[PDB]
Paper text:
PgDPP11 exhibits a strict substrate specificity for acidic residues (Asp/Glu) at the P1 position (NH2-P2-P1-P1’-P2’-…, where the P1-P1’ bond is the scissile bond), whereas PgDPP7 exhibits a broad substrate specificity for both aliphatic and aromatic residues at the P1 position. PgDPP11 is a homodimer, and each subunit contains a peptidase domain, including a double β-barrel fold that is characteristic of the chymotrypsin superfamily, as well as an unusual α-helical domain that regulates the exopeptidase activity of PgDPP11. Biochemical studies and crystal structure analyses revealed that Arg673 in the S1 subsite of PgDPP11 is a crucial residue for the strict Asp/Glu P1 specificity of PgDPP1123,27,31.
The crystal structure of PgDPP11 in complex with citrate and potassium ions was determined at a 1.50 Å resolution by analyzing a space-grown crystal. Two protomers of PgDPP11 are related by a crystallographic two-fold axis of the C2221 crystal and form a dimer. High-resolution diffraction data obtained from a space-grown crystal enabled us to identify two potassium ion-binding sites and two citrate ion-binding sites in the protomer of PgDPP11 because the present crystallization conditions contained 0.20 M tri-potassium citrate in the reservoir solution. In this study, the citrate ion was identified in the S1 subsite of PgDPP11, and the other was identified on the surface of the molecule and found to interact with the side chain of Arg536. A distal carboxy group (O3C5O4) of the citrate ion forms bifurcated salt bridges with the side chain of Arg673 (O4(citrate)–NE(Arg673): 2.8 Å and O3(citrate)–NH2(Arg673): 2.8 Å) and is found to mimic the binding mode of an acidic (Asp/Glu) side chain of the P1 residue of a substrate peptide. A water molecule that is hydrogen bonded to the central carboxy group (O5C6O6) of the citrate (O6(citrate)–O(HOH240): 2.9 Å) is accommodated in the oxyanion hole of PgDPP11 (N(Gly653)–O(HOH240): 2.9 Å and N(Ser655)–O(HOH240): 3.0 Å). In addition, a potassium ion was identified in the P2 residue-binding site of PgDPP11 and found to mimic the binding mode of the positively charged N-terminus of the P2 position of the substrate peptide. The other potassium ion was found at the bottom of the S1 subsite and appeared to be trapped by an electrostatic interaction with the side chain of Asp681. Comparison the binding mode of the citrate ion described above and a dipeptide docking model of PgDPP1127 indicates that the potassium ion, the carboxy group of citrate and the water molecule (HOH240) mimic the binding sites of the N-terminus, the acidic P1 side chain and the carbonyl group of the P1 residue of the bound peptide, respectively. The bound citrate ion, a potassium ion, and a water molecule in the S1 subsite of PgDPP11 were regarded to mimic the binding of an acidic amino acid and were utilized as a pharmacophore for an in silico inhibitor screening.
Residue numbers in the entry: 22 to 720
The structure:
Amino acid sequence: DEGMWLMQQLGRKYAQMKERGLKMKEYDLYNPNGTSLKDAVVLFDGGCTGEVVSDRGLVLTNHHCGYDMIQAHSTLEHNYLENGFWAMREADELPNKDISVVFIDKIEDVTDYVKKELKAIKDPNSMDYLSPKYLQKLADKKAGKNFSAKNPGLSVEIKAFYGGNLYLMFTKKTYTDVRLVGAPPSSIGKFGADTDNWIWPRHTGDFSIFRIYADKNGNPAPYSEDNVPLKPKRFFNISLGGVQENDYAMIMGFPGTTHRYFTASEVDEWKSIDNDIRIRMRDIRQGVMLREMLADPQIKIMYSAKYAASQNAYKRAIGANWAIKTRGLRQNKQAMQDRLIAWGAKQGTPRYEEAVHEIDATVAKRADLRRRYWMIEEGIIRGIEFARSPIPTEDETKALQGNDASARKEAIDKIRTRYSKFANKDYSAEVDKKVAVAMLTEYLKEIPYENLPLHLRLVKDRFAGDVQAYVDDIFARSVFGSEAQFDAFAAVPSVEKLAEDPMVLFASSVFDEYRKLYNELRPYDDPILRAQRTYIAGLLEMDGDQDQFPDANLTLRFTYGQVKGYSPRDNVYYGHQTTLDGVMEKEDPDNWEFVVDPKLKAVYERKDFGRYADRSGRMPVAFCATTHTTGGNSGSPVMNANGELIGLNFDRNWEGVGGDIQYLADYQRSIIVDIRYVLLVIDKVGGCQRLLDEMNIVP
Ligand SMILES: [K+]
Ligand SMILES: [K+]
């Protein structure tokens, strides 16, 4: 069901949750002064979500959330990324540099406090009401003198909600000794990762396992061998019961951003500028990279990760534009603004209509600048690798202006480091030239001569419109066009040559235009934010908050729904549950994405599923639910009707990515690893019994 709800809204939503099958008492899910399931949810390393699953501080999150830590501990001798990792005693769990988990110890509505303090600010158009520095000064004032000394590991933050109409203060408890305990092999953790990104059905065992360490009283402490596992106030019980179609499911976690209050004009702008440009420019870039990767196996090795990275937000933009085209997103926002405008007229209060018209007018005024910004960002800053070639600093240019040879040597050395990082082992000058010719052809079609970065005016003025000749000239003459050209430069460095370098002048020119567009566009954000404060206040006055969730803002939310598949297209149905049979159907030993771990294959051959399969002998892998998630919900716990852990959220289907603007009941799903499959992998693949024995596994 729709919405990413504040914990304060649990009372408002409880009747709807019970209608969908919730059996918990409200207090046990969230309460403000006691212990609740909210106390087992953590913010994992500043983006992801995770959950406490034992009375000794065991934490589950996704494999993709734990990846950087698994990779940091991996070597040729112990390649944990490929083999997995299973600590067979607590003393073998691996500490992690610069890691955190954050508990939300307390939440408080401070709206009246912040609105009182904002009365002091004289300028009615001040943006201090949304300023992180200003709200942190209010938090510090409220928490009082020596809050930190009186509360080990605790800190406070105030955040704005509903466009500045509501403020909450969070008291956060931060642990920095968080050790790696367990991870499946990447073949399981990343099964289908690029090909199946944003796809349901999905077959990925996307989990990893950490443990929170602390002092002997459970307070946060920096890494020490004297630290002991946290004895937490709440952990999740793990259900062996499984899921069935239509079962209630709920999620808690930290969704980052939504746009539920876009005007119709903002939907049109998101389609016609942001998404259309991203789709067109990435289709060009990807099409050239694919052609070069198919033709040369070494180019495939070098460019595979850059290609999949481009494809990530490409696929999301295609899904978002699909929803705008087919699912009525614009008309939904048109109806929302039309309803409030009709009500405002009945109330004798034109300020809501004025707010919608101010947003419309700002969107219309910025259209050509925003188009230019997205064209340069997708077409060149992201699109063309040599845009990020080195630019000598003034110090470096002075340094080899001079006759001090040793400062000169030091300037060349600094430049060499940036060149080596640019033209690294994954960089092909030939691929970059082909990509640049295709991307600049599009860019020069769309951006008129008078609005070009100055260096690009040389295509018309010096090369007679021949983009291939222009790009050929950059690489031919630049000291960064090849390793031999850089080495020749480093040997007899000419200050005149460097100031005239066509790659340096190209890079400088396109970053200059990008910067000047950014600076001219930024001011247009503020009138829309101020109008949204009014627009959202009207919507809330008119219809209340029960069916109007506040946009995500990196804070703790709950969502509820049911375990349920969907029909993507005519005569096609995707059910609610994938199985291990589906992993084996997808097995391809010559595609890294679809390798089946040999212990997992033997488990499947033997039907060695313990108590983790269904009664018919089918071993679950993933399920999907009608919960409302977005980026920031990776790793989130999935609870059944009784609050027991049934899975871990790890993705969303592409049909649902428009759901940041408008939830789609018949299309949007959260993609979740079944906890039964996590237990099977710990047991039969890791052989790590002590982790099963420390959990509370309930029927
Ligand atoms: K994804
Ligand atoms: K988002």
